[PDB]
Structures are given as structure tokens and as C-alpha cells.
Design a protein around this ligand. Structure first.
Ligand SMILES: Nc1ncnc2c1ncn2[C@@H]1O[C@H](COP(=O)(O)OP(=O)(O)OP(O)(O)=S)[C@@H](O)[C@H]1O
Ligand SMILES: Nc1ncnc2c1ncn2[C@@H]1O[C@H](COP(=O)(O)OP(=O)(O)OP(O)(O)=S)[C@@H](O)[C@H]1O
Ligand SMILES: Nc1ncnc2c1ncn2[C@@H]1O[C@H](COP(=O)(O)OP(=O)(O)OP(O)(O)=S)[C@@H](O)[C@H]1O
Ligand SMILES: Nc1ncnc2c1ncn2[C@@H]1O[C@H](COP(=O)(O)OP(=O)(O)OP(O)(O)=S)[C@@H](O)[C@H]1O
Ligand SMILES: [Mg+2]
Ligand SMILES: [Mg+2]
Ligand SMILES: [Mg+2]
Ligand SMILES: [Mg+2]
Lengths: 737, 737
């Protein structure tokens, strides 16, 4: 019901199509009930448009060539004047459009190449086929007694509609044959189909660019301020320039690209004139889009700058963006790879308030990027893209293109023994029959160094409740504090209470403190930001107080989301504990966390998990009624839950039938979950060794698990069990003394 | 099978050659089955090319001078128009090539030197020898009744093929005799044969430069993006300019060298025009290579710069490299000695993504450099290059050239008593009979200070399993966790488990904590990066947070590789231990190691070793299931393994026969391996003293070892043995409390 806007169905007119044996393109397909509900105006001419000012003409009411009471669609139209079946016809009445001076005809191929002679001897014959020299906007017919592979590039035209040319005007004939680069750089313009992964941000870009420009009166009638400043920020190489280039081609607005280094490459004084002219050009036409690439390169912070020209550039840009009123209809957007260096005077209201985060795509997101990038190459049958999307983790849009290039080149290397190095006249059986296989992708995958290993990884984790063995007590409670306030807000609002925002995890180490948070994030279909203990201590030492500011608000922007603080023990380990150095464990970072976690409003859905295994050195400041008041104890797995833990850990291994899990679960009493995983890893490693020994069968037998128990190592002592139990019954008493 | 691409064999046409007594060069060697499989076109002329536009002509079908049914090859062609036997003939059809204005003949030697007279009296006689003035592209015959040592330098020519000159054109005759420097600086151009050691990086350079330029259509057919930015980085003096100069001479592309300081030597404003002209010159010719030497000198970081001209230069360079599309076919490459000062805006995608590491060569690598450098000098019979390669450790390409220069000059000093200092007319018996001997090399080797002592040393270590005595338990296990996941990935992938990445070494000190890591690195044929304890503490104090970033990723780039953290005790010693100053031992560096070691993907083959001898002060954060979960105990050598330790330590000493190893191994119970090495060192030192005493025999006798036992010193106390045993049984319990 909520997602019933993208669908378009329940209309008994459209039907599925498949491959048929009807390839007769003599006449185009029409519809008899089409004009029956429309009131057209006839008598001189009709104004209509198709796609990219390109339309075809045919015969009208000259049927009776084949059998009626049927329909068909040829597959021939997938290479010109068409991108796919299911294109909506867009017609906008707009007379008096841009016009050139005059162009009649120009030659490209038949200019000087080969024999010329008188030139009216070779193409005059294959022309008289019932056509009185039809002149239109792309009416070209295919007639050839040979290969039927003739094509001439005629793209540039001054008119949108048809027109009648008039005599008594002189035309210059000083043209020149052009190369293929200018046409290829224009035909390969990207659009909304060439971008994948960032399916969410494109909705915002469309709703905030296309809507105000296409319907200016609709926004004025309801009285809404159109956003005129959009800043695109995120990791480098995610494709920030690609959306900017895509939104320009699909809109009828005048696009003006402004580069960052290009502006600074000019001399002193001359650079400001470029910005002034760029704004003036966009101002005199109402549909105009201004994109400033790499804003940080031209608009740095005024508190760190050294040159006086940069300050003048920033001041000029500030004045120019303030001079734009609502009658300009100019949407200024910019892209940068670090939002932190942008001058704060630009990111405030009226200049740049609307911000779009281009984050790192998921396995689903990068799968579509791979499918887009590999759409032009030739792959084999064993080519599995979602696998490669799975193993790739920190890969961004440009990383995938580099990986594809490396995989393609590795395929080139395998054929170097047959392809001559000096002879350039290679045979034609090597440009087509060779495709990229799995050895190529797997080889190139091992030595790929992505540029996106350092940011926060924003997912719904893949860890579900199946990976966690036992612990049925905590599964219900963790749901009761996370899912209820987000699924049924009315039930909470009726009682007039405040849901608790924050849960602390403590207990013996290696028992599921991280898997629980990942599982509770997976089921809620929300994001998951994990921050480790030493991860906070290294990200500070450069004396950077603003580093965590873009971390806390990131969770708020990606609502709903959960915040995880794993390995909290190491954070308190830097100063000790109850006495520590001389006082508590609340060092520089703990105070930061406490100060910022108080500013989160209750009406939000942001949620925080803290996980630690050192309750004796934690400070009372963390456990406040409103920060981490929920204290949940994870006990050691007992006889009943170890079977489930082992079943979860053995889901991917071909375990035998004669092995008894509950039998080997009965003297593994005083262990933890991490100990059981290590036991299983040793047991399966013994299987690998045995399997490879006999080669000079690959199943985990009973003896493989029997040998592991003798070498088993206990991770928690008897004193620690009692100590954990005695803290678990009584923790919050630590507050006060 | 994997390395079957470099070989070229199984063709019954080529055979080995040796020194023969046939030196008749009247006719060249041909092949009768050569045209039998080729369909040539005859009737006017044939187009063909040899090497460097130089070919020889001879008589055709004028045989019957000697016996047939045999073949021979003269040794005379090793000084001109030839570099060696086994050169492939390269022929590329390309008409209409670069042409000059006109040159007929120019005199060089017979211009004004000596007697001239009428000049048509001395060389007209020795010319009429059945030759109707043959004019070609290097058809010179040797005819002289004297020494047969006549040679004139004719190198510059406008045509590649033969041509017929035409009259009715005026030719200027205002030439001048040139010196020998311009010809020597061009004939000594380096190539792929003048560079040794970096055999791996040259493959990447070739595959990423020569392939896209020689076969532009092959890459377009498969749809692969050609790399247009290559950055060469590494230690200074490794030869970064040499590869740049070598790749230009062997390619037919237009090379444009851009120096770093040369650009900045210009005035304000005039420097940008040089870059603009350099790019414009390369753009109008499709085959073009642009090399920017010392990029850091012209493209520094914008956050540290002071002048405004440098920022404009960086912005201009950024704009220019962005303006290059695929139709330019221009590959821009650059070299720098510090990659860290390069502006981050240049090292990202689209400008400089493809990076080549020119590391320090090995003993094998530097051996080839020595062989290349000494190929022009005259050495004696006792000259052993691989020895000198062995003792040289931190020596780079320029260090070896300096060492050779010093060794040559030391040879000059030995003859100063006979060579006159003021008389310049020295006898000819001192420029040839004097060669460099071992006293020269050994003398110059002692006072050589290399410039490459400070980086990370990336090898496969020379320490093998033979150097480690006993410890048969750890040898199998260390293999079972390193070699199996890299040799049989399918066996691991079938069971669907995660191999453990990380092994911690603990135990009594001086027992083989470093030799084990070196041995496991040697057998895997992988790299080995060793980082010591205090080595991390000194590399920090300058408040440099980016220093270790280029350390961790270096191991990933050189896959497979192992990471070693030796002397971990000193790192934890700076803050104490369980209580320490006030808390744990996890100071600034430990948190860094933990944060970065979590980011390594499982699918990689990077592996980490930690070695320590202070398990009581280690913190629980290191021992996490996924960082260093593998805990291996190295016990003290018992009675059985001490014999092997002594045998390993005595492999290079001439040990006598009457000495009994197991007899002296029976009361050396409570020692360690380092104690046995020290015992053997004292025992052999006593032998040196005895050998030199009697001179005013050189074998280690029984009494030499008997005297060492009395002076033996124990390194581990009884309390320490029990304490180590009690921690070894129970370590991981330290996690939690
Ligand atoms: N979602 C995507 N789909 C397809 N190609 C993408 C995508 N994102 C990036 N790319 C490719 O990545 C390359 C570089 O794209 P850019 O837009 O230049 O990256 P960026 O995020 O703007 O950062 P920089 O500063 O420009 S490198 C191009 O070859 C794009 O085609
Ligand atoms: N309930 C469980 N069932 C199965 N495996 C578990 C369970 N709890 C933990 N593990 C395993 O234990 C290892 C680490 O799990 P974590 O949840 O990170 O442990 P932890 O409780 O957070 O304490 P540490 O200090 O991080 S080991 C992984 O290999 C998990 O698969
Ligand atoms: N692999 C090598 N083989 C032979 N000579 C080498 C090699 N590497 C360096 N050299 C010599 O080292 C000297 C300097 O070489 P360069 O290319 O200038 O060094 P570099 O690595 O470029 O660093 P700088 O900044 O130029 S000193 C020359 O005499 C080279 O012949
Ligand atoms: N198993 C062994 N066999 C022979 N020599 C050994 C053995 N173990 C150590 N040594 C010698 O001991 C010395 C130092 O070896 P290391 O492996 O570096 O000692 P360690 O265990 O790392 O502890 P320290 O603190 O570095 S001495 C060298 O001279 C080695 O040859
Ligand atoms: Mg960009
Ligand atoms: Mg955990
Ligand atoms: Mg240099
Ligand atoms: Mg050592």
C-alpha cells in the first residue's frame, strides 16, 4: 500500500511480448480504440513530438498486407531512435524555439574519398521508389541489394518541428569533415539508466530538481520555497560527477558546468569574471542548472587560508548565490569529496541547506553497478556477478570499473602466445571468441586495493537470529525495546511514557555481545554503525575535535539506525577504573559520548548499544536514567543452548550423521560461544589435513571431533564465573561510591 | 604450466651456435623453406624494415663460393646494426612518414684537417669495385689494404625507406663540423636491457603502456579503459628516471620530458604557458607519452603550501589532466621519491590511479645491476659479483654505481707510484693491463654509506627450517595455518569456514620467536615485513599519524606477505601492564594496530605474526577471536632438541670428530637456544685465540668446548620456568578480569 506509487498496472491495454517469427516492418502498429476517447483537431496539421526530436513516418490507411485480428512488434528497433519497449511519449507545447541560420545539406563520407566523378551518377538511381524527395526530421529508408548496412550520421538540426524552407537567401559552403570523437562524446551521454546503486538519493534529486522546473506554478500555488542549493558529499569515486552529468541531459534546462581547478588556473582578477559571466549566462534564461564541481577546491575555510585571492573568490561566490531570487529558477548544486573543509558560511540557510549523502552502495547496490559496467563487454556462461558483489566490501563505483578493467586485461594475457606482438594485422577470431571467465575475475580480485576502507560502514548487517545459538531470553527483550517503539508508536503514545533509548551489554567475553546487536539491527531493517574501542582512541590523537561530529549526526540522518559501541573495555582501559590513574575512567572520549548522547530527542528512532566485558572498571556516569539505563546480562551458555550454538556454527560444513552434538555438549560446561567456534574450527582443520594427506573422504567424522576435545582450552576460570555472577546481580550500586 | 608464456621452443628451426673457424662474410645466410609457406607479391619492389631503420644489402643468387649443406654465423656483427643473436624482425606498414627538407651529403672528417688539395684525388680510386654508386640507407663496404679500421658517422636521415631524389631544387651548404658529445649522448640511450633488478615492475609498465599504444583497437573491442595515469614512487636512487628514459626510446610515440625544478625556474605566469604548450604538443599526435619528473616538486599539498603560484600550478595541472579524453592516446606518467607529499586530489581516480612501487632489489636483483654496471669495465678472474651482492643490504641502484666508481679509483691509487702526476703522456701499458681485484672492492665496501637503511625491508628471508633446531611440534602447526589456505583454497571453501588470520608467539625469551617467523616466510615464497618494539615508539614521537598508513597497505600490495611484530614486550613496557601507569598497556600504537588489523578481509592472503615474551603484561584486547586468536607456546629445548640446535649452529664451523654433542647436551638442561649460540661463540673464540697465539691447528677441539661449559651462564631461573609453565597452560583467562 505504501509502495503503490512506482507500480503502473490494472489497465487492460498492455501485454507482455516475446520473440516471434514476424519481422515485417512495412507498417507500424496502431490502436483503434486510441482516438475513440480523444477529441483531436483536424484540418491543417498536428503538432506532436517523440523522443530527442526524432520520429518516423509511414503510410496511412494502406493496410491489407497480412492477416488482421493480431498484433506484433519487431525487434529491429533497439539500436536507433529507441532505448527499450515501454517509453512514455512526452509532448510539451512550446512554439518559437531556438533556431539557427540555415543548413540545407552537408557531405561527410562522399566528399573526396574514392572516386567522385560528377557525383550525380551513383545515388540518383536507387532513389525513385515512390518518394517525391521527402524532407523531414529523420525520414531515412533502408534500400540495398547487398548487406543492408548503410548508415550516415545526421544529428545536428536547427528545428524541433517540420518547416518549409524559403529561397532568396545565400548559404555559406565552407564546411569540413569532422572526426568520430565529437559524435561519440555526445551519443554516450549518461542518464538515469547509466547510474546504479544510489537508488535512494536519485529520488531526492528528482523531487528537488525536476519538480520545481517542470511545474513552477504548482509550487507557487501551494506556497513552498524551492530549494536552490544542493550539496553532494561523500567518499571520492562514488560517482558525484555522474549524477551531475545525468541530470543535465534529461532536462531541458541550460546546463553550465563549472570546474574547480579550472577556475583557479586563471590569472589574478580574470577568475572572478568567469564566475560573473557564468552566473549572468544562467540568469537570462529561466530554466538553468549551475553545477560547481569540487567546491572545496575553490571555497576553503577562511580561518586556514593563506592567499588573498581565495578569500575574494569565496566572497564573490557568497554574494552571487545571495543575488539569486525566485524569478531566476536557477538551482545551484555542488559536489565535494570532503564536506569538512567547506567554509561554514556556505553550508548555512539560503545558500546550501539541502544536502544529499552519496554513501557506499551495498552488495545489491554494487551488483547493479557491475551489471551496468559489464553491459558492453562479452561474458561467458559461468559469470556470476552477485558473488563478486558479495566478496567486494569497500569497493566504490570507480573501484568496480578498475576491477573490470583488470579482469579484462588478465584475459588479454592468456592469449599472448598466439597474438603477435609486432604484427598489428591480428586475426579476427580473437576479438570475439574470447570472454572473461572466473579465473580472470578471481585473479584481479586478490590485488585490488579499494579507497573506501576508512569510513563508517552503514548497513543492515547480514547476521540474523539463526547465527545466534540459544539465548531465547534476550531475543524477546531486545525486540521489546527496539521493534515496539518503531512499529506501534500509538501504543507507546497512549500511555504517555518515554521509551528508553540505550541498552548496555555486559557479561563474560565471547558470548554474543556483537552478534546480538547485529541480529537486532538486521530484523528491524535499519542501519547499523559499529564503533570499536581502540577505533575511538586512534581517531583522536591528531587533536581533531570535529571528527565525531559527522559521526553522531550520520546516524540521525539515516533514520532508522542503531549505534553500536563495541569493545568498550579498551576505552576505559586507557585510564584504569575506580582509581585508575588517579580517578575514574571517564577520559576525553567518554565525556564526548555522554554529552552528545543527551542531545538526542525522544521522538526520534535512533538507538544506541553499548557492549563491554569489564563492569568493574566502568564508571557510574554511563549508567544514567536516560543514557544507558537498560542493563542486560548475557550469561554463559548452558547445556541446552550449546547444541543450538554448535548447530548455528555447523550450518556450512558437511557434518556427518554419526556425530552426536548433545553427547559432546555435556562436558563442555564451563566454556563460552567463542570457545565452541574455535573447537569447530580446529575440528574442521583436522579434516582438511586428513583430506590432503591421502591425496598423495572430505567429511568431518567422529574422530575429528573427538581429537578436538582433548586439545580444548577453557577461556573463563572458576573465579571469573563467580565474579561475573556477583556483579551481574548487583551492578548499579556502583553509582554513589 | 603457469610460466609457459616467456618460453619459445618446440620449433625445429632454431639451433645453438658456438665459435667456429668460418669467418667469411661474402654472402649472408638465407633459408630455403622460408618463402615456401609465404605468399609474397613480386613485380616492382618490396617494403621491409629491420632495426632502427638500418639494413644491409648483398648479392642475390650468386652462390657457389664454398661448400653447401651447412650453415654458419660470423661473429663480426656485434658492434654495429646489431645487439645480439636472436632479434625478432619487426615490420609495421605505415606509409607517408616524417620527412625533412633535403640532405645529399655532408663532410665531417675530410673538411679542413690535413691536406685537402682538389679532394677528388684520393678516394675516387678505391671506389670502382663493381658498384655503380649504390645509394641506400646504410650500404657501406669495408675495403682497405691496411688496418681495416675506417668508420664515418652517418646517423641522421630523413627517410625510413629508400627514395629517388629529384633535381631542380636548391640546397643550402652552410653546415659545420660537430663534436662527439651529441652522438655519444644519443647512441648510449638506455633500453630494457640496461635496467636490471626490477623485473616485476617492468611487466606492469609494458602491459600498461605498450599494449594500449600498439593495439588501440584490441582494447576498444573488448571494452577496457586504458590507464592514463601512472605514478612511480619509491626510495630515491632506485632508478625511477631510468625506466622513464628506457620506455621512450623503444616506443614510436612522441616523448615529452617535463622536469620539476625546470618548471619552477621560470618567472611568474610564464611557467603555466610551458605546461600548456607541453600538453598541446602531445595532443596533436596520437602516440604521445608525457613524463613529469619529480611531481612532488611542482605538486605539493595545498594544506601546507605558502605561495599562490604553486596553487595555480596545481590547479592548472589538475585541469589539464582532466582535459585528456580517450582520443588523445596520451599516457601521463610521473615519478617521485616521496609519495606522501603528493596532493591527495591527484592520487584519486581519473588522474593517478595506477601506481607502481619501485622497491629495493634483492641480492638477485642487485646482482643483475652489478653485472650491467660492470659490463663496460675490465675485471680479473677472481671477480665474484654475487658475493658483493650478498654483503650489500641497503644498497640501491645508484649506491652500486658509486661503489663501482670507488673500487675503480682504489685500483688507480695502487699504480700512482709508476704513473707520473705531471706528465700527461703516460705509457699505454697502464690503461689495459690494470683490472679491479678483490682488495679494491673489499676496501671500497667498508666505507660505503647507503641511503636506504630506513625503510621497511621487503623479503623472503634466508632463514630456513635447517637453522631451527628441534621444535618439530610448531613446524607442522605453523604450516597448517599458513600454507594450507594459500595452496588449497578449495579445501577451505568447501567446508565454508573462516581461516584464522593471526598467530601470537609467547614463551621463554631466546627460543626461536623470530627464526620461526622467518622460516615460515621463507618456505611460503612470500614477503616478510618485520617491525620491532622500540621501532614503533621512535617512529611516532614527531606526531605523524599517517606514517603507519603506508606500512599496513604495503603488505596488502605485495601479496602474499606476512607481517611480523617482534619485541612486543617493549611496546607494552612503555605503560606497564595490568595496572601499569593507571590502566592497561594499550597505549597509542596498540590501539592503532588493533583498529587497522580488523580491516583486513578474509579473502586476502595477508597474515600477521605477533611475538612477545611478557604474557603477564599483555592486554586482553590483542587476544580477540579474529585478531590474534591463535596462541602457540614455544617451550624450552629439551634433551632431544638441543643436539639439533647445536648442529644447526655448528654448520659453518670446522668442528672436530672427537667432540660429543649429546654428551655436552646432558647437563645443559635449563638453558635456551640463545644460550647455546653464545656458548658456541665463546668456544670458537677460544679457538681463534689459540690459533693466533701459536703463530708468533685452526680447528675446534674437545678442550675448547670443555672450557666453555665452566664459563656457561644460565639465562632463565627456576621461578621463571614454573611461571612460564603456569601462564602457558592458562593465558586467555586473562580476558575478563
Ligand atoms: N553508480 C555508478 N554507476 C556506474 N558508474 C559509476 C557509478 N559511480 C561511479 N561510477 C564510475 O566511476 C568513475 C568516476 O566517477 P566520478 O563521478 O568521477 O566519481 P566521483 O564520486 O565524482 O569522485 P571524483 O572526485 O570525480 S574521482 C566513472 O567511470 C563512473 O562511470
Ligand atoms: N551465541 C553464539 N552462537 C554462536 N556463535 C557465537 C555466539 N556468541 C558468540 N559466537 C561466536 O563468537 C565469536 C565472537 O563473537 P562476539 O559476539 O563478537 O563475542 P563477544 O561477546 O562480543 O566478546 P568478544 O570479546 O568480542 S570475543 C564469533 O566467532 C561468533 O560466531
Ligand atoms: N636498475 C638499475 N640498473 C642500472 N642502473 C641503475 C638502476 N637503478 C638505478 N641506476 C642508476 O642510478 C643512477 C641514478 O638513477 P635515477 O633514475 O636518477 O634514480 P632515481 O630512482 O630516479 O632517483 P633520483 O631522484 O633521480 S636520484 C644512474 O646512474 C642509473 O644508471
Ligand atoms: N631453535 C633454535 N635453534 C638455533 N638457534 C636458535 C634457536 N632459537 C633461537 N636461536 C638463536 O637465538 C638467537 C636469537 O634468536 P631469536 O629467535 O631472535 O630469539 P627470540 O626467541 O626471538 O627471543 P629474543 O628476545 O629475540 S633473544 C640467534 O642467535 C638464533 O640463532
Ligand atoms: Mg569529481
Ligand atoms: Mg565481539
Ligand atoms: Mg629523478
Ligand atoms: Mg628475537
Amino acid at each position: 500500500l505504501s509502495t503503490a506509487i512506482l507500480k503502473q498496472k490494472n489497465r487492460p491495454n498492455r501485454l507482455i511480448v516475446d520473440e516471434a517469427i514476424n519481422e515485417d516492418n512495412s507498417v507500424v502498429s496502431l490502436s483503434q480504440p486510441k482516438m475513440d476517447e480523444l477529441q483531436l483537431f483536424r484540418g491543417d496539421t498536428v503538432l506532436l513530438k517523440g523522443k530527442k526530436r526524432r520520429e518516423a513516418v509511414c503510410i496511412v490507411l494502406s493496410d491489407d498486407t497480412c492477416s488482421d485480428e493480431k498484433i506484433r512488434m519487431n525487434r529491429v528497433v533497439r539500436n536507433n531512435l529507441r532505448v527499450r519497449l515501454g517509453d512514455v511519449i512526452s509532448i510539451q507545447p512550446c512554439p518559437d524555439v531556438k533556431y539557427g541560420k540555415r543548413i540545407h545539406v552537408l557531405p561527410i563520407d562522399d566528399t573526396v574519398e574514392g572516386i567522385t566523378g560528377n557525383l550525380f551518377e551513383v545515388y540518383l538511381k536507387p532513389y525513385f521508389l515512390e518518394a517525391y524527395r521527402p524532407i523531414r526530421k529523420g525520414d531515412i529508408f533502408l534500400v540495398r541489394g547487398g548487406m543492408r548496412a548503410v548508415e550516415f550520421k545526421v544529428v545536428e538540426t536547427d528545428p524541433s518541428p517540420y518547416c518549409i524552407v524559403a529561397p532568396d537567401t545565400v548559404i555559406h559552403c565552407e564546411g569540413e569533415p569532422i572526426k568520430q570523437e565529437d559524435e561519440e562524446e555526445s551519443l554516450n551521454e549518461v542518464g538515469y539508466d547509466d547510474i546504479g546503486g544510489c537508488r535512494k538519493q536519485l529520488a531526492q534529486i528528482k523531487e528537488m530538481v525536476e519538480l520545481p522546473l517542470r511545474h513552477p506554478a504548482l509550487f507557487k500555488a501551494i506556497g513552498v520555497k524551492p530549494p536552490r542549493g544542493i550539496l553532494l558529499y561523500g567518499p571520492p569515486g562514488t560517482g558525484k560527477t555522474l549524477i551531475a552529468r545525468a541530470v543535465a541531459n534529461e532536462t531541458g534546462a541550460f546546463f553550465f558546468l563549472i570546474n574547480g581547478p579550472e577556475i583557479m588556473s586563471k590569472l589574478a582578477g580574470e577568475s572572478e569574471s568567469n564566475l560573473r559571466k557564468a552566473f549572468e549566462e544562467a540568469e537570462k534564461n529561466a530554466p538553468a542548472i549551475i553545477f560547481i564541481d569540487e567546491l572545496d577546491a575553490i571555497a576553503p575555510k577562511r580561518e586556514k587560508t593563506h592567499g588573498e585571492v581565495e578569500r575574494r573568490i569565496v566572497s564573490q561566490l557568497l554574494t552571487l548565490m545571495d543575488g539569486l531570487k525566485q524569478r531566476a529558477h536557477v538551482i545551484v548544486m555542488a559536489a565535494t569529496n570532503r564536506p569538512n573543509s567547506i567554509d561554514p558560511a556556505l553550508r548555512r540557510f539560503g545558500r546550501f541547506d539541502r544536502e544529499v549523502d552519496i554513501g557506499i552502495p551495498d552488495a545489491t547496490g554494487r551488483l547493479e553497478i557491475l551489471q551496468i559496467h559489464t553491459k558492453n563487454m562479452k561474458l561467458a556462461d559461468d559469470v556470476d556477478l552477485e558473488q563478486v558483489a558479495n566478496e567486494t566490501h569497500g569497493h566504490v563505483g570507480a573501484d568496480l570499473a578498475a576491477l573490470c578493467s583488470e579482469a579484462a586485461l588478465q584475459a588479454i594475457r592468456k592469449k599472448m602466445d598466439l597474438i603477435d606482438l609486432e604484427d598489428e594485422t591480428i586475426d579476427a577470431e580473437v576479438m570475439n571468441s574470447l570472454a572473461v571467465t572466473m579465473d580472470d575475475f578471481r585473479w584481479a580480485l586478490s590485488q585490488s586495493n579499494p579507497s573506501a576502507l576508512r569510513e563508517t560502514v552503514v548497513e543492515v548487517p547480514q547476521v540474523t537470529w539463526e547465527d545466534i545459538g540459544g539465548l531465547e531470553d534476550v531475543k524477546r527483550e531486545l525486540q521489546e525495546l527496539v521493534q515496539y517503539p518503531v512499529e506501534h508508536p500509538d501504543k507507546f503514545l497512549k500511555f504517555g511514557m518515554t521509551p528508553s533509548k540505550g541498552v548496555l551489554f555486559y557479561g563474560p567475553p565471547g558470548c554474543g555481545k556483537t552478534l546480538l546487536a547485529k541480529a537486532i539491527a538486521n530484523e528491524c531493517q535499519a542501519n547499523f554503525i559499529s564503533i570499536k574501542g581502540p577505533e575511538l582512541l586512534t581517531m583522536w590523537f591528531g587533536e581533531s575535535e570535529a571528527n565525531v561530529r559527522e559521526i553522531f549526526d550520520k546516524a540521525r540522518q539515516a533514520a532508522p539506525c542503531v549505534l553500536f559501541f563495541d569493545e568498550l573495555d579498551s576505552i576505559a582501559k586507557a585510564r584504569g577504573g575506580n582509581i585508575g590513574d588517579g580517578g575514574g575512567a571517564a577520559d576525553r572520549v567518554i565525556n564526548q559520548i555522554l554529552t552528545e548522547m543527551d542531545g538526542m530527542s525522544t521522538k526520534k528512532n535512533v538507538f544506541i548499544i553499548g557492549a563491554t566485558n569489564r563492569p568493574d572498571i566502568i564508571d557510574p556516569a554511563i549508567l544514567r536514567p536516560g543514557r544507558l539505563d537498560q542493563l542486560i546480562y548475557i550469561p554463559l551458555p548452558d547445556e541446552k543452548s550449546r547444541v543450538a550454538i554448535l548447530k548455528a556454527n555447523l550450518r556450512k560444513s558437511p557434518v556427518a550423521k554419526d556425530v552426536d552434538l548433545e553427547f559432546l555438549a555435556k562436558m563442555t560446561n564451563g566454556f563460552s560461544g567463542a570457545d565452541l567456534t574455535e573447537i569447530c574450527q580446529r575440528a574442521c582443520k583436522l579434516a582438511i589435513r586428513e583430506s590432503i594427506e591421502s591425496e598423495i573422504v572430505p567429511e568431518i567424522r567422529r574422530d575429528h571431533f573427538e581429537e578436538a576435545m582433548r586439545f580444548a582450552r577453557r577461556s573463563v576460570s572458576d573465579n571469573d564465573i563467580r565474579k561475573y555472577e556477583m556483579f551481574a546481580q548487583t551492578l548499579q550500586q556502583s553509582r554513589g561510591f
